[PDB]
Each structure stands twice: as C-alpha cells, then as structure tokens.
Amino acid sequence: HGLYLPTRVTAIHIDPATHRQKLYTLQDKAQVADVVVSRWLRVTVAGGVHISGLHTESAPRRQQEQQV
Amino acid sequence: KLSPDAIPGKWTSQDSLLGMEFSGRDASGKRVMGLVPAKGLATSVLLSPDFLWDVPSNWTLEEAASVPVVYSTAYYALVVRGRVRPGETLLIHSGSGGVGQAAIAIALSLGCRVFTTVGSAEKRAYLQARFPQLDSTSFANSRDTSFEQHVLWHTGGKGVDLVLNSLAEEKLQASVRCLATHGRFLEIGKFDLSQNHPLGMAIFLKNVTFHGVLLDAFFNESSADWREVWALVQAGIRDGVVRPLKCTVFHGAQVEDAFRYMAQGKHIGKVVVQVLAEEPEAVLKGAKPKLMSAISKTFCPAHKSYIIAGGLGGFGLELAQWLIQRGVQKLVLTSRSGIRTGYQAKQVRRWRRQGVQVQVSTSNISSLEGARGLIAEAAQLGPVGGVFNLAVVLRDGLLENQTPEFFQDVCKPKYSGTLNLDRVTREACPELDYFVVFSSVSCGRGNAGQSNYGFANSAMERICEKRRHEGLPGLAVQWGAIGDVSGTLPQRMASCLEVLDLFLNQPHMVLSSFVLAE
Amino acid sequence: DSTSFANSRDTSFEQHVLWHTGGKGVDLVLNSLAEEKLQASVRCLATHGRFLEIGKFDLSQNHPLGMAIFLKNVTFHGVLLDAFFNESSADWREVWALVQAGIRDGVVRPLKCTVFHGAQVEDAFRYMAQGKHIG
Ligand SMILES: NC(=O)C1=CN([C@@H]2O[C@H](COP(=O)(O)OP(=O)(O)OC[C@H]3O[C@@H](n4cnc5c(N)ncnc54)[C@H](OP(=O)(O)O)[C@@H]3O)[C@@H](O)[C@H]2O)C=CC1
Ligand SMILES: NC(=O)C1=CN([C@@H]2O[C@H](COP(=O)(O)OP(=O)(O)OC[C@H]3O[C@@H](n4cnc5c(N)ncnc54)[C@H](OP(=O)(O)O)[C@@H]3O)[C@@H](O)[C@H]2O)C=CC1
C-alpha cells in the first residue's frame, strides 16, 4: 500500500522495429500493444520494450492535507 | 527518515511499528524479557514463547530491557555468521552503542584482541571503565577514517579478522581495507545496502566473506535457525557473559522526552521507557496492568460478524477494507446483482486469500423477511457485531418531474431498510455494538432536485436518534462528496475514513463532515 | 533431471532457474563465469544465499558489485584454494579429512581422462586449449 516510485532499473531494451511489428490495430482506430508482467522473472515486456529489475521505494506522502 | 513499510512482514496502516524489545511479567506471573518484530512500545505485547527468555533473580526488570536486541544481534553476527574463534582480532565500530558493547563482551570472553571506535573522549573513558582488558591502544575515532591507520599500524599491516561494521559511505570503504586474509566482514548498517553503493570485488582475492547481517529476518521467518541464537543468549546469561547495559529510564507519560534524548545522540547505553514499576514479589500473578488513558480508536473482535449493506458499492468496498484492517475476519456484503465488475471480484478474492470469511448475499433489506435472512446468515458466520446501511437508489429531478413511484424507489433501501434492520436487531442481535447509516449533506443543508433523497436520508436519522435514546447504538454520518470512489469540494477517501474513525467513538447521534470550496 | 540444465554461454540461465525455483532462487551458487554472467548469477540468489566465487577475472579487475544483495540475507565468499599451500595447514587438514571420507564412502569418483604420453605434452596443451575436452 502507498505510492512507490522507481529508484533503480537494471536493464531496459528498446527495439522500434519489433515495436512497430507487435502493435495491432483494434476494432476502433486506436492501436494497442499487449503487456505481460512476470514477477517471478522480474521482467515487464510490452511491444518493443522490455524492462528488467525495476526497483521502487515508498515515497512519504506530501501530507499537504489540503482538505481540512 | 525511514519508511514504515521497510520493516519485514505485512504490517497494516503503518501503525504501532515502534518498539522491538520489552521486559515484564508473563501471563502466569513470571518475569520475562522478549524480542518482538514491532509494537514493543505498549502496555501489552502478544508474542510467541520462543522469543521469551527468563530474567535471573539477580537482575532487575529495568536491566533486562537492554539485553535482548543487542545481545541477540551480537551473537548472531559474531558466533553464527562470523564463526569467531579464540585469539582472533576484531574491529568493532561504535563501541559505546549497545551492539558494540555486546560484541566487546562476547569477544573479551573468548580472549580476542578488540579494536573499537568511539566518537568522543567521555565514551572512551566509559568503555575503559567497563572493560579493563581494553588497553589505551584499542581505541580509535569513529568520526573520521583515522581508525584505518590505527588498525593497520598496530596489527603490523596484517589487518583484522572480523569487522562488525555499522558506519556508512567512506567509512565503510575504510573498514574493508582493514580486513586480513580469511577475514570476515559483518555488515549490519543498512544505508549503503539500501543505496546499492558499489563494492570493488578485488578484496575477494584475499580469502574473505562479506556477510550481510539482518536480524529482522528471524522475527518473521527462519524460525528453525532462531533456536541457535536463543540457546547462545541463554548460555551467555547463565555463564555470566551477558551483562546488562546502563539504562536511562523515562516514565510512560514522558515518552517524547525519551525520543528527543535519543535523537540528540548524547546517550551512552540504552534508553528505556518505564510503562509500569516493578514489584518486590517474584511472581505477582497480577490480573491486569494499571489502567491508563489513551486516544480511542476503533477495533473489532475476531469472532463477531458484520453486515455492510450495499457493500459492493464504491464506498462499501473501501469501508470493508477499512474494517478488515481493524480486525474483522468475517464479513457479509449485500447487493441485488452481486459481483458484476472486476474491481469487486479483485477485492473479494484478496480478502478471501487474506483469511477473511467474506460472503456476498442477495438478501434485500427492504423486506422484513429479507432482513431476517440476512441477520441469520450473519449469525451462521457468527454473532452479529455491527450493521452498516450504505444502500442507495437515486432518482433526481425537480418536484414537478417527481412522482410517487420514484419516491418509493429512493426511500425503500434507506428508509424501509433501516426500519427492518432496527426491528431485526432489537429482536435477535444481543452482541451488536455498531449500527451506522450514511446520510448526505443534502439532508441537512439541502440541494435542489434531490427532494426524495433528502426525505430518505432525514428518515434514517430519526431511527438512529431513537435507538440511542433507548440505550441501543446508532449513528448517522452526513457526508458531503466522496472523491476517489452544495458548494462542497469532494472529500478524499483517506480523510473520510479518518473522520469515520473519529465519529464512531463520539457520544452524539448525528454527525456531518464536508470540505468547503475555496 | 531434464529440467536441471541451462546454457552457460548465454545469460538465459537466470530465467530458467528463477522460473523453476518458483521465483525464490538458489541457496548456493558456485560461479566461475565472466562479468555479465557473474552479475546474472547474483540475481539468482535467494534469501540466506551464499555466492561461492572461484573465478579470478572479475576479482582481478576489481569490477563493481551492487550492495543491495546484502539486504537479502547473503554471504559472498572468496574461495582460493591456493592459500592452503602458503599457510593455514591446520585448516587444510579438514579438507583432507573430507576428501578421504569421500574416497572411502564412495562419493568421490574419478573423472574421464584423456592420456597423452610424456613426449606429446605439446599436443596435450593444444588439445586443452581448443576447449573440446570433457573431464
Ligand atoms: N542488522 C541489524 O539487524 C542491526 C543493525 N544494527 C545497527 O548497528 C548499530 C548498533 O545498534 P544500536 O545498539 O541501536 O546503536 P546505538 O544507537 O546504541 O549507537 C549508535 C552509535 O552511533 C554513534 N552515534 C553517536 N551519536 C549519534 C547520533 N546522534 N546519531 C547516530 N549515531 C550516533 C555512536 O558511536 P560512536 O560512539 O562511535 O559515536 C553510537 O554508539 C546501529 O546503527 C544499528 O542500526 C545493530 C543491531 C541490529
Ligand atoms: N459517496 C457519496 O458521495 C455519498 C454517499 N452517501 C451515502 O453513503 C453511502 C456511500 O455509498 P455509495 O458510494 O454512494 O454507493 P453506490 O451509490 O455506489 O451504491 C450503493 C450500494 O448499495 C447497493 N444497492 C443499491 N440499491 C440497493 C437496494 N435496493 N437494496 C440493496 N442494496 C442496494 C448497490 O449495489 P446494487 O445497485 O447492485 O444493489 C451498491 O452496493 C451510501 O449509503 C450513500 O447513500 C451520502 C453522502 C455522500
């Protein structure tokens, strides 16, 4: 619980050609790319992007409490 | 400076993580000292007997509070991980601190030559007093890297065999250079590790083991390996190696002063908080601790059952989640259609996995038979503890457009439902302690086009007011606008839940909460 | 078993081990690989793991090693058997006893051997240099 922000990433690969290949147009005009998250292998893969070793650390809330 | 979620184990709401050790009477009246992963600052601690030692008759309960954490971590770091043997040489940073003192006590028992780092000269005098075996050449400065030259010169350039390190950044690198062949490094500080600071691997050409010592793992896992450390501490206590640290006692009402004294960093030894005094009797077999005043916050028994009408609604799911975090382990949620969206299914599955005995009912509280069936289901899960009526059906439009059917539809789940709930609860709910119905500021302040909604909401308040006057519980909360799920800005969910926590513990009948625009 | 194998020349063994271990890792790692492979091996470690390193290249070059592994209980070791020949004989007798106990129990088995006569030492060295030998 609470918001976690990225602090480290071990490796990011980008391949625009594979990215264009993987995109598939939906029944609407909008395009889409399927994304799979494997926590066991610590890999997020979507289109031509592949993130591994993402580390997130809890950032304390600003406690602005603008609502009183 | 430290996020509460960093502590291992899924603690909820980040509440009461303070405290790790205590010393007090057991349920049977035996003096005991313990070690809890969290929630040690309290007038009562729930613990497994594996994490409880015995306080020998020579000791006073005050002294016992200093032993557990520091001596357990020292033993685990040296004996279990560093496999210390007699005659070795150790560099123990921050001797004045508790862990440093315990490490010195363990090392001097085996006969090792001990190098220690102390920030000032008063701490040097103290350590020289406590441990006469230390010579004048065994003290370095912990506020600069000068200790490296000291260790290197006085060891003939060979180095040290063990290093119980707690310093950070440039100090850590300087510590490694003191290692000798086959030397072991015991990292207990958690700054560089959290920051992923690099460590050159060239030190490993010298046969070297770089241990990471984290005792927080035992409190939550690795139970089998704990008995080793427990046995070591018990053996030390019976043999006399374990000697309590000097304690600066602070009374219960002055805990902020204790925290400030610790923060200033001038303390030597351990700071302890005296929740209660020690009695001369060896086994008092006392009934209860002396009562004290504390801010009142809501909690629920594990064996009772709660009913959230309209629990699959936007606010109902958040209210249930709040209830689960406060100790509810059997819940009944009502909805005409049932689970029909992904978010609801996700929440119910997570709650069921957590062990909560969630149950979705189609019983309609509009009809008396349906209300009786709902309460019977709650009884099947267990005694009814609380009833929350969050059902709503909206039909907006000015009076010229309104019609009797729309009024009936809007009033049924809120007006009739509350009447039937009150009847069935007065009939067959003796253990009930909460009965909350959620209203809207439209009832009090008024808002055009919501005449029927206001009528329904105002009608719920009367039932609650009658219930309280006759001795039974009741509370209507007039909310404004709920944001995450007039002239009033929408109110966030966390603020709403905090306010609800306040409201439940007030003695009044109808309460309101809203956020003014600009 | 058939699932006990991976590829050493590629860094794809990390996914194999992590998948087949249920995502936990491995308790003991005996690594002798290069820089990128060495880094990949560390990420295979589990809580209370122990990285036994017997290579030299990364150690010799003083390559960096992230200290976030330590927050997971971990024990990085430097294993050089050459230390025994220079000192620590009393520590060596333990290894000697272990080896003898293995010999008499049956755990120790001789490895497959390719024999080159004394006059053909150069051929033996070339054959080993090629890298196709097993045993
Ligand atoms: N891995 C684990 O699970 C554990 C880790 N540790 C860590 O090792 C250390 C020993 O624990 P503990 O007994 O609680 O230590 P203490 O808090 O009792 O002592 C900390 C030491 O830091 C120095 N110091 C002086 N003034 C300050 C100040 N204002 N702020 C911070 N440090 C100051 C002193 O050494 P000096 O006299 O040289 O100035 C002092 O002895 C801690 O840093 C602790 O986090 C130990 C136990 C458990
Ligand atoms: N959130 C807000 O802005 C404010 C709301 N309130 C009150 O506070 C509570 C907040 O809930 P809210 O987020 O509005 O909920 P929703 O309006 O999103 O849904 C109401 C819940 O009750 C159920 N329900 C609807 N009709 C009936 C019925 N006839 N019998 C039984 N259950 C029914 C709904 O499921 P289903 O339709 O499938 O039955 C749903 O679970 C409600 O009591 C609301 O009236 C007042 C002030 C502020």
Side-chain angles (χ1 to χ4, degrees):
Chain A
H1 277 286
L3 62 88
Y4 289 73
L5 304 174
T7 303
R8 314 194 299 268
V9 182
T10 296
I12 300 171
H13 296 65
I14 300 165
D15 185 358
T18 311
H19 182 78
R20 289 192 290 269
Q21 287 181 347
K22 291 284 197 67
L23 292 159
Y24 62 88
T25 306
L26 196 43
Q27 81 284 321
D28 200 329
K29 308 304 188 67
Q31 295 190 1
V32 177
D34 191 356
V35 57
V36 296
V37 174
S38 302
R39 193 159 283 96
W40 278 7
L41 312 180
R42 296 290 195 85
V43 299
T44 315
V45 193
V49 186
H50 168 282
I51 309 184
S52 184
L54 174 68
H55 187 73
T56 66
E57 302 181 2
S58 168
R61 308 303 305 275
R62 185 55 173 174
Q63 68 172 23
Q64 168 50 26
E65 60 170 2
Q66 59 182 2
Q67 289 188 354
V68 55
Chain B
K1 302 159 67 65
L2 179 64
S3 66
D5 65 329
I7 294 89
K10 293 302 295 295
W11 310 95
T12 311
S13 70
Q14 320 312 284
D15 169 274
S16 194
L17 271 52
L18 293 185
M20 284 189 294
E21 47 180 352
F22 72 105
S23 67
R25 284 269 151 69
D26 184 37
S28 303
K30 189 217 296 180
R31 295 149 77 235
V32 290
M33 61 182 167
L35 178 57
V36 62
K39 301 166 61 177
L41 265 171
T43 76
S44 299
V45 58
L46 175 56
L47 191 56
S48 60
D50 292 333
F51 293 100
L52 282 166
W53 286 278
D54 288 2
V55 192
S57 299
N58 307 275
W59 292 8
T60 61
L61 266 172
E62 179 177 357
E63 292 169 342
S66 306
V67 179
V69 164
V70 306
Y71 271 97
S72 182
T73 185
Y75 268 110
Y76 176 52
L78 291 183
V79 176
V80 182
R81 299 287 300 272
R83 302 190 71 78
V84 65
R85 308 294 171 200
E88 292 179 5
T89 57
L90 302 84
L91 174 61
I92 308 174
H93 290 288
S94 62
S96 65
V99 175
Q101 289 192 43
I104 292 166
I106 297 164
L108 296 190
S109 69
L110 305 168
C112 303
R113 191 168 63 162
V114 184
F115 289 111
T116 74
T117 72
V118 295
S120 64
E122 47 266 13
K123 297 179 177 174
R124 188 173 298 186
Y126 177 74
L127 279 184
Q128 183 69 97
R130 278 265 288 195
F131 302 109
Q133 284 83 333
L134 295 176
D135 305 331
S136 301
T137 68
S138 52
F139 291 99
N141 186 256
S142 180
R143 301 295 175 82
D144 57 356
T145 61
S146 65
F147 60 87
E148 182 191 351
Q149 279 69 29
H150 194 106
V151 174
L152 288 168
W153 178 263
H154 279 100
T155 59
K158 297 167 63 56
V160 285
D161 290 327
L162 271 166
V163 178
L164 182 63
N165 171 32
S166 179
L167 307 170
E169 59 162 76
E170 165 54 36
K171 303 267 201 295
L172 190 139
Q173 312 308 119
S175 306
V176 173
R177 310 185 180 108
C178 308
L179 289 171
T181 58
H182 310 278
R184 291 131 290 175
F185 191 95
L186 310 177
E187 178 59 24
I188 48 167
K190 277 176 277 291
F191 175 61
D192 290 326
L193 312 190
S194 61
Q195 293 293 76
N196 193 333
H197 278 183
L199 165 55
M201 285 182 286
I203 190 69
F204 295 106
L205 290 170
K206 313 158 61 168
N207 272 271
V208 160
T209 315
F210 205 106
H211 296 269
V213 174
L214 290 94
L215 195 70
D216 58 68
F218 285 168
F219 311 151
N220 206 13
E221 293 189 350
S222 305
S223 64
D225 310 322
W226 169 245
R227 305 309 305 170
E228 194 67 12
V229 176
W230 192 97
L232 287 172
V233 174
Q234 183 71 81
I237 286 163
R238 73 167 178 266
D239 194 13
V241 172
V242 182
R243 197 161 71 269
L245 320 179
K246 72 198 162 309
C247 308
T248 307
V249 66
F250 287 104
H251 286 253
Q254 286 71 48
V255 58
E256 79 296 6
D257 295 358
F259 274 81
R260 289 194 189 290
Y261 181 66
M262 276 285 292
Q264 288 182 315
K266 58 161 60 57
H267 65 81
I268 313 176
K270 185 62 71 69
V271 177
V272 187
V273 167
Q274 168 182 232
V275 179
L276 193 62
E278 179 181 5
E279 310 84 346
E281 314 302 342
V283 177
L284 182 65
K285 62 174 67 54
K288 63 170 182 56
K290 181 62 175 179
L291 272 65
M292 87 184 293
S293 312
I295 298 168
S296 192
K297 88 190 292 296
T298 300
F299 289 109
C300 302
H303 67 265
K304 290 180 180 180
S305 75
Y306 296 96
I307 308 159
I308 297 95
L312 299 181
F315 193 105
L317 294 172
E318 307 310 327
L319 179 56
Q321 177 61 13
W322 183 77
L323 284 172
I324 299 310
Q325 295 177 348
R326 299 304 191 83
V328 176
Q329 281 192 356
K330 50 185 74 62
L331 211 62
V332 178
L333 316 177
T334 291
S335 170
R336 293 175 294 184
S337 182
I339 304 288
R340 74 188 187 286
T341 66
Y343 192 78
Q344 300 160 333
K346 179 183 202 294
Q347 296 307 332
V348 298
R349 280 179 202 176
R350 179 167 61 79
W351 297 335
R352 283 179 214 258
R353 281 188 254 269
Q354 280 185 10
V356 181
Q357 202 167 346
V358 185
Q359 191 188 19
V360 302
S361 307
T362 183
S363 301
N364 194 9
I365 62 182
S366 300
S367 60
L368 186 51
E369 60 184 356
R372 288 197 210 178
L374 179 58
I375 295 286
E377 288 185 3
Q380 287 291 352
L381 277 71
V384 179
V387 175
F388 301 75
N389 182 331
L390 277 53
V392 54
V393 172
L394 287 177
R395 310 290 160 84
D396 297 2
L398 282 67
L399 182 55
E400 59 192 342
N401 302 320
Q402 285 300 331
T403 192
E405 296 294 329
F406 286 5
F407 270 60
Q408 288 191 19
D409 298 1
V410 176
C411 285
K412 271 166 65 176
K414 279 188 162 298
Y415 182 27
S416 300
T418 306
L419 284 173
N420 298 282
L421 273 176
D422 180 14
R423 190 163 172 173
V424 182
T425 284
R426 289 187 183 179
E427 189 164 346
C429 287
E431 301 289 351
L432 187 142
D433 57 4
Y434 293 127
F435 176 97
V436 183
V437 306
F438 282 43
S439 166
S440 181
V441 291
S442 316
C443 173
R445 253 64 166 203
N447 185 25
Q450 286 197 339
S451 62
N452 50 39
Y453 190 54
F455 181 96
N457 279 0
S458 181
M460 300 169 94
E461 300 183 2
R462 306 297 94 93
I463 298 162
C464 281
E465 287 187 353
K466 182 171 283 296
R467 277 187 66 92
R468 181 62 63 91
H469 175 280
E470 296 186 359
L472 300 169
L475 170 66
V477 183
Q478 298 182 11
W479 288 103
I482 314 296
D484 292 331
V485 311
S486 60
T488 61
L489 190 73
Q491 190 172 10
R492 312 290 289 175
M493 196 68 263
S495 179
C496 292
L497 289 187
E498 289 174 1
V499 167
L500 179 68
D501 193 354
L502 190 165
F503 281 179
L504 295 157
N505 291 300
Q506 295 296 285
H508 308 307
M509 290 149 283
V510 180
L511 301 177
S512 63
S513 169
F514 59 105
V515 179
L516 281 180
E518 64 270 355
Chain C
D1 195 9
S2 67
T3 76
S4 287
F5 287 109
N7 190 20
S8 63
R9 308 202 171 285
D10 190 5
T11 175
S12 66
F13 57 83
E14 184 183 348
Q15 284 74 27
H16 181 80
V17 166
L18 286 181
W19 178 264
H20 282 278
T21 44
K24 311 297 292 303
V26 295
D27 301 320
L28 207 47
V29 168
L30 189 73
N31 171 278
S32 60
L33 304 187
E35 52 191 354
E36 68 189 13
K37 314 303 195 321
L38 184 153
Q39 297 294 334
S41 299
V42 174
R43 298 176 264 175
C44 294
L45 278 177
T47 316
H48 312 88
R50 307 173 283 283
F51 195 85
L52 304 167
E53 179 59 21
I54 59 180
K56 299 275 172 51
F57 177 67
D58 287 317
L59 280 60
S60 63
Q61 301 301 125
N62 198 35
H63 284 150
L65 165 68
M67 279 195 287
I69 184 72
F70 297 116
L71 293 169
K72 296 180 182 297
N73 209 246
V74 156
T75 308
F76 198 116
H77 302 261
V79 177
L80 302 190
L81 196 79
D82 307 79
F84 291 115
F85 312 132
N86 191 16
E87 66 281 331
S88 70
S89 58
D91 200 319
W92 160 256
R93 291 297 296 177
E94 184 173 1
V95 183
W96 190 93
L98 288 163
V99 171
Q100 184 65 80
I103 287 166
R104 64 181 190 72
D105 290 7
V107 173
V108 171
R109 263 196 308 180
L111 289 58
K112 184 186 74 57
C113 293
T114 76
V115 189
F116 294 88
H117 287 65
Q120 283 76 67
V121 64
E122 182 182 347
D123 292 337
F125 273 79
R126 285 180 187 172
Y127 181 71
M128 194 163 264
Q130 284 177 8
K132 300 296 296 188
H133 65 83
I134 291 170

